[PDB]
Amino acid sequence: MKLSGVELRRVQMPLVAPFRTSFGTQSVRELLLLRAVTPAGEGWGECVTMAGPLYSSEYNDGAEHVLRHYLIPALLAAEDITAAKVTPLLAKFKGHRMAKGALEMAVLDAELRAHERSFAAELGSVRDSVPCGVSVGIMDTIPQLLDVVGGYLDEGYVRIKLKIEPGWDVEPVRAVRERFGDDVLLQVDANTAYTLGDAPQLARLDPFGLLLIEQPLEEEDVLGHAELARRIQTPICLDESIVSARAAADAIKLGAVQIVNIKPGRVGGYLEARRVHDVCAAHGIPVWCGDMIETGLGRAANVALASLPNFTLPGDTSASDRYYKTDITEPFVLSGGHLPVPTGPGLGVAPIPELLDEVTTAKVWIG
Amino acid sequence: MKLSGVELRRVQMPLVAPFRTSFGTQSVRELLLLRAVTPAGEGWGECVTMAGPLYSSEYNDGAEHVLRHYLIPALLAAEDITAAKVTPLLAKFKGHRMAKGALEMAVLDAELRAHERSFAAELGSVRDSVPCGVSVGIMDTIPQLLDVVGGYLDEGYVRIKLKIEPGWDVEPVRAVRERFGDDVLLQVDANTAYTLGDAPQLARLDPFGLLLIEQPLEEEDVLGHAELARRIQTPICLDESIVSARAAADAIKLGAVQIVNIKPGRVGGYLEARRVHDVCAAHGIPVWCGDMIETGLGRAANVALASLPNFTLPGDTSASDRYYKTDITEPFVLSGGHLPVPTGPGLGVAPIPELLDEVTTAKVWIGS
Amino acid sequence: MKLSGVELRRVQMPLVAPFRTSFGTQSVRELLLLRAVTPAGEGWGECVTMAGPLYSSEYNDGAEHVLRHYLIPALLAAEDITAAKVTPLLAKFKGHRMAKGALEMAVLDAELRAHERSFAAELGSVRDSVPCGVSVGIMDTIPQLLDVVGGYLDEGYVRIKLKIEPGWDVEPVRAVRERFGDDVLLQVDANTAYTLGDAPQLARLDPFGLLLIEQPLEEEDVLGHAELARRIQTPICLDESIVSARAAADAIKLGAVQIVNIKPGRVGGYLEARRVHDVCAAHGIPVWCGDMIETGLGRAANVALASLPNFTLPGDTSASDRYYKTDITEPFVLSGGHLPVPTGPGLGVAPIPELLDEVTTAKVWIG
Amino acid sequence: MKLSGVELRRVQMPLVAPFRTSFGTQSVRELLLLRAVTPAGEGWGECVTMAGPLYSSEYNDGAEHVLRHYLIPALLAAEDITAAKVTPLLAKFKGHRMAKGALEMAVLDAELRAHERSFAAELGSVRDSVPCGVSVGIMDTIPQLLDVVGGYLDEGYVRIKLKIEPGWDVEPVRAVRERFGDDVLLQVDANTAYTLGDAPQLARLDPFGLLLIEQPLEEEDVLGHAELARRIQTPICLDESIVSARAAADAIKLGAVQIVNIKPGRVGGYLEARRVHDVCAAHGIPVWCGDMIETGLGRAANVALASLPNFTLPGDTSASDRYYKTDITEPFVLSGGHLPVPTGPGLGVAPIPELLDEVTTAKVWIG
Ligand SMILES: CC(=O)N[C@@H](Cc1ccccc1)C(=O)O
Ligand SMILES: CC(=O)N[C@@H](Cc1ccccc1)C(=O)O
Ligand SMILES: CC(=O)N[C@@H](Cc1ccccc1)C(=O)O
Ligand SMILES: CC(=O)N[C@@H](Cc1ccccc1)C(=O)O
Numbered sequence A, C, D: 001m002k003l004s005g006v007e008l009r010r011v012q013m014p015l016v017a018p019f020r021t022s023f024g025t026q027s028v029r030e031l032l033l034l035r036a037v038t039p040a041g042e043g044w045g046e047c048v049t050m051a052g053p054l055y056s057s058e059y060n061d062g063a064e065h066v067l068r069h070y071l072i073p074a075l076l077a078a079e080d081i082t083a084a085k086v087t088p089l090l091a092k093f094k095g096h097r098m099a100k101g102a103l104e105m106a107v108l109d110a111e112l113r114a115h116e117r118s119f120a121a122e123l124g125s126v127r128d129s130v131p132c133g134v135s136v137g138i139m140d141t142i143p144q145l146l147d148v149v150g151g152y153l154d155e156g157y158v159r160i161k162l163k164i165e166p167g168w169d170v171e172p173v174r175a176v177r178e179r180f181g182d183d184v185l186l187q188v189d190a191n192t193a194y195t196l197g198d199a200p201q202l203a204r205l206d207p208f209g210l211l212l213i214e215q216p217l218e219e220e221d222v223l224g225h226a227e228l229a230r231r232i233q234t235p236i237c238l239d240e241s242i243v244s245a246r247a248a249a250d251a252i253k254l255g256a257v258q259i260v261n262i263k264p265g266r267v268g269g270y271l272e273a274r275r276v277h278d279v280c281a282a283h284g285i286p287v288w289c290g291d292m293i294e295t296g297l298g299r300a301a302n303v304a305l306a307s308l309p310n311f312t313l314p315g316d317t318s319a320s321d322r323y324y325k326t327d328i329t330e331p332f333v334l335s336g337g338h339l340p341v342p343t344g345p346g347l348g349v350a351p352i353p354e355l356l357d358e359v360t361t362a363k364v365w366i367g
Numbered sequence B: 001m002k003l004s005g006v007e008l009r010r011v012q013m014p015l016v017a018p019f020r021t022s023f024g025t026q027s028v029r030e031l032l033l034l035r036a037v038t039p040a041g042e043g044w045g046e047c048v049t050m051a052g053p054l055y056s057s058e059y060n061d062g063a064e065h066v067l068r069h070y071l072i073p074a075l076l077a078a079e080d081i082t083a084a085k086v087t088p089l090l091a092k093f094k095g096h097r098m099a100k101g102a103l104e105m106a107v108l109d110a111e112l113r114a115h116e117r118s119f120a121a122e123l124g125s126v127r128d129s130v131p132c133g134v135s136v137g138i139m140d141t142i143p144q145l146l147d148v149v150g151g152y153l154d155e156g157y158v159r160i161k162l163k164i165e166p167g168w169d170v171e172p173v174r175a176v177r178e179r180f181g182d183d184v185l186l187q188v189d190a191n192t193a194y195t196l197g198d199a200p201q202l203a204r205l206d207p208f209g210l211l212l213i214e215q216p217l218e219e220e221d222v223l224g225h226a227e228l229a230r231r232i233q234t235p236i237c238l239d240e241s242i243v244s245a246r247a248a249a250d251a252i253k254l255g256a257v258q259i260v261n262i263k264p265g266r267v268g269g270y271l272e273a274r275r276v277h278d279v280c281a282a283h284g285i286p287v288w289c290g291d292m293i294e295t296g297l298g299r300a301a302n303v304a305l306a307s308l309p310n311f312t313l314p315g316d317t318s319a320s321d322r323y324y325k326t327d328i329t330e331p332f333v334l335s336g337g338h339l340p341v342p343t344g345p346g347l348g349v350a351p352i353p354e355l356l357d358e359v360t361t362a363k364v365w366i367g368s
């Protein structure tokens, strides 16, 4: 394809309830969307950056700037483009994985629409729907946490993940176990909030049968996680540290991880995400699909990815209404604890123009 | 896509010159081809078995049988099929990777034709052509070997691989180095002909600067290779042992391998092959494309596979005329030491009906 | 000490000769300078970013944005600032190490000036001058390389470093050895241009007695370097991979590095740089001081840093005129192959206001 | 700074209550103090030796002799002097770390006073007060132990350390746990009193949830401690073995230690101590500040050191009145379980001349 241009938009979508993590509290989701335009048709991408660099070094204004001044111009200057060629065309730019992933996603959506092929088919889907868990934030009190968890369990979510941080770990876990029992699939996520010195506190999670503890230590501390896995019984899962398939392989060989959370944007796109999946499967490491509170666009791509064979644990791809009263696409609706994999060409969904215009704060054409 | 049926044919194609390996001499290539038929269109697969179980346990009649009685029926019984779903549909059947790979190849060719998409685009090609080496058989004498190698070097092949076995290793290598010099890319391939007890003989290859030695020990002896790598300077490459992406990861972690030969049929198909490629790349292990003397059909798929980013050494996908006077497809022709990656839908090539009929020995229809 | 504000300036300084590396060619140095203002006085910092993200993910506009919107406001909101506290005050922001380092540098310069204390004394200097090498770019031809190298050797530089890349490695090295002999201190630097599959080409450097090969593989590939070190005789040095003292310790323990290049901006500042020095010294790993074509400001801080006890190989801190016809501070002048360690308070140099104004392209006050 | 001379004094300070360890009972603290005199002003150091070589090979008369005949003359012969240059000026003398450390401390106090800079600022303090534990000696009976511990807990000490030895380990620990409960921070210290053959006895401490067991085996037996860590659940802490940052790195790599007690005199001074802190932090090893029953002078320097970022467990820097009815400086007073980090120049404290004269037993001038 020849890329004619890309429209970049900033969108703001209010959340149904505030979402608190060890790095802070979010009440509105601000994001960047991309519309890649080729002579044949268009494709949509979604950046998973947030407003500030609190989860990783990338953030919305930074992703916008790098897309406008470096990444989109490199793609416009090439003759033929394909999604696979996006990686070597952008390889001279270090990092900026989320931005590159978004751009790749838009290119891939346009390419696959031209071949009348779904994301699911391109990625190697083996099932038509996927079981979905839910990620539950840090709360002000224990009774408020139990109400929220009970609510998600009644809606049919198959697994519960709790955000944890120092001063909110063992108690919320103990309380969820006391109230809802030992058969609920339960896990925790620290988003880098601990150090190796906290190993005795994290070992106090041992009796509760957690599936995993996700990213207890900082992003760059892979050996620290391997040392941590020698001191605790709960399996380690990595999120932030898994920036590439090579990073996954390294972490696996060092003993730092037993389960991997795959987030396509974090690894530089859906094509790298499939490679992470395949590296993990080859080492016997189960994977599950992460969530960055995406719109229906990212959600649809994630649901497709999550239908791959080594996604053997429930992902964080919850229904649209877990986060948004009104999505910009046709919404994802939970049915028997599952979401259906989209069947149309490309992502299988597209923004509803009037809904997208209501939440658009800015736009620019790069061409 | 519903599979309506598959035609299986047996083909016999005379080779331009006999091809001798440590497991014997071949003057005719006998193979199984598969034509998958769907309501929308057809796709071709090619099985890389030989007549008897000399390279691996699988062989032509065996592959034919398992395809007819187990693998094709399991696909005919499914409602919608995709090339990815072939693996879980056939997982209850142990082994038979080359047979499964052929079937997957045919399904993939048909699927991708329906989307007007090339094998290269599906697999993640980043280049439009690939540099090609050649594999050179065991000869009766040294002067005959040097003639053949000189000939391939004049045709523009960028790398030479020599078949070796006890009684034909160090001397042919020394002679090729003496006659053509130290700048030729050179490697050797034993096809499992040594044991760990031969480590001193294989260490005598050390001074010749070989890129690699391919599969010195038996298929199942991964630890033996890692022990061998501690006793010799030439990098170990595995072929027969690499049956899967998991096998590649295991061998890598054990220190048994530094470069991997990928053959899609040997690993159960092009989709597993891409996974092998990706596993290897994630560990810093270069890969190159192996060759099983395929027709233009397999050759086309191989050339597309060889255009992926971690194929950083020249493969064995030589021109059609290295093996066959006349191929059953449009032939691959060497140009500046390279072959072009096919651009059409699916494989980008298809059999020429009159040429295919001339070499068909037997045919059978399975399904409706 | 409270921070009153920070002035940020963009500067453009023409190079005396273009400088080519595996990631491209530079003829003008564009940089960000910081003037921190406190009630105790002013201090100067220098960011080592370039215009685009080619050496690392950080670049001038991105560093500027993050300093203005996140980092400088976090320091302005603090009740007490001391250079040591800058790190925990900015720890909530992920990455942006060069930006953080620049800000820390300016804070430190102001703080040390108030105490009439030099950078050298603060960092733990044990000597009054340091031996200096020179970094030599990729050239169009071999005879041009040998002319440049001969010229640096006549000026009295004690060590030669050659930029290398595929197609310019073994030949330039062989030629320098053939022309100038085996007693010249010689090393190479790839800036991440090779892969592990290139181990045979890099092993062809073995006979030439190189001090080291610097950063042959990509930034995130630590295990790859440890494998590389088992296949080649030339000691491995890391630059880009060494992002922190913790990264250094990890790389050392994994066998990935024998010598460490310390660049203070790359690790998030002079205080982390001293920690990298001390971690390396504790493991018996020599260090040397890297260079990012800094003005006299950065150069002065680097020369002080390079006077620490475990800096036992010559650094890349060349004389000012190796890069700039006219520096913005008093220039560093080579004498007997050495540069003198500055003796005044803080950095021991400051910009000459008229020279700085001539090269300033933009200025903003953040208060 | 040229050193004009040093006054060395011997001091004897009665303890409020005798303090029994596995190596014997102390009722009076005998120590060496140093007053370094430069043309600008003076600085105080404190040697942590005891009267005889029971804790380590160094003792008061030996430290005094080496200071007088080797160490102080080497510094007086040097034209240019800084605290950082003390190490290479004394490096030709093997060992005598506590003596070297005391001399470095005095030099540093004078240097920093001339720059109007606190120990805290020089070392890299990130907080203004530190939480303080207490070390409790071996008693004749269990009820006497429980009385003493209950008394320290009522005063607000945040952690209890028990001295242990064969015949006084499991029982005192069990009793403290039965009386005061599982939430008290509790650890033990053997001062080298066990052998690897006592692993079964030390494993009987496993059920009591101790933070650590400090130096169970002899000083030089690093591999023995790593073996011991495989046989017991209580984390191993080293004191006597950690004689340098390099020693710490070695012990960490061998698996011999999980937490490190830092004592500045033991490692050859406050500047080495900061290196130990930084080496440990880079390996994920928490540190805590040890106590050698110093006067207010050492105590002030320790409190500053204990305010560094990786001091994440409570130290043994108890209030002055834990040991001494009357200190020679302004006393450290516990407030809410914390001591305040001094804010003046240098140590931030100096001896009260009349109090110092009351406890001085001998004085000499070296000049
Ligand atoms: C669903 C969820 O927990 N997402 C992120 C955290 C996150 C929080 C806020 C905004 C985006 C992502 C995680 O898995 O770490
Ligand atoms: C081209 C070549 O040497 N191919 C096989 C040998 C072979 C020939 C024919 C049939 C099967 C295998 C190998 O690499 O082992
Ligand atoms: C002096 C030198 O070689 N500097 C950098 C490269 C560099 C060039 C230009 C600007 C910044 C960095 C290095 O050591 O990687
Ligand atoms: C406070 C304490 O227990 N100090 C020493 C013991 C000691 C007692 C008397 C004099 C010096 C050291 C230790 O931690 O080993």
Ligand SMILES: [Mg+2]
Pocket (backbone or CB within 6 Å): A189, A191, A214, A215, A239, A240, A261
């Ligand atoms: Mg997470």
Ligand SMILES: [Mg+2]
Pocket (backbone or CB within 6 Å): B189, B191, B214, B215, B239, B240, B261
């Ligand atoms: Mg082979």
Ligand SMILES: [Mg+2]
Pocket (backbone or CB within 6 Å): C189, C191, C214, C215, C239, C261, C290
């Ligand atoms: Mg460099």
Ligand SMILES: [Mg+2]
Pocket (backbone or CB within 6 Å): D189, D191, D214, D215, D239, D240, D261
């Ligand atoms: Mg002790």
